């Protein structure tokens, strides 16, 4: 299922634009068919939605979504 809380190990690339772990990277790779919804999220969504949050991804070499 698609869970915000998923994000976690990219926490701080998402809340603070750090150059995101590799960790998190691979993380990103594997659940990028969540991004839109994640995006959703009413709690977190706003996070997701971010200028950090697409740095973190073109950081880790994602495309960014047009939601
Ligand atoms: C690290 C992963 C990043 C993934 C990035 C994806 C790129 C996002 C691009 C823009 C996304 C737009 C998506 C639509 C967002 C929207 O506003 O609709 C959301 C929605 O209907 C569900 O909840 P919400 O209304 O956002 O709730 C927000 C808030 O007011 C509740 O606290």
Known sequence: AC??????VCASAILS?????GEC??????????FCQYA????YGQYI????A???????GLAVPHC
């Open 3 to 8: 869970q915000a809380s998923q994000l976690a």
């Open 17 to 21: 634009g750090a150059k995101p772990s």
């Open 25 to 34: 990277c691979g993380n990103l790779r594997a659940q990028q068919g969540c």
């Open 40 to 43: 959703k999220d009413p709690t």
């Open 49 to 52: 939605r971010s200028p950090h």
């Open 54 to 60: 697409r740095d973190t991804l073109t950081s880790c």
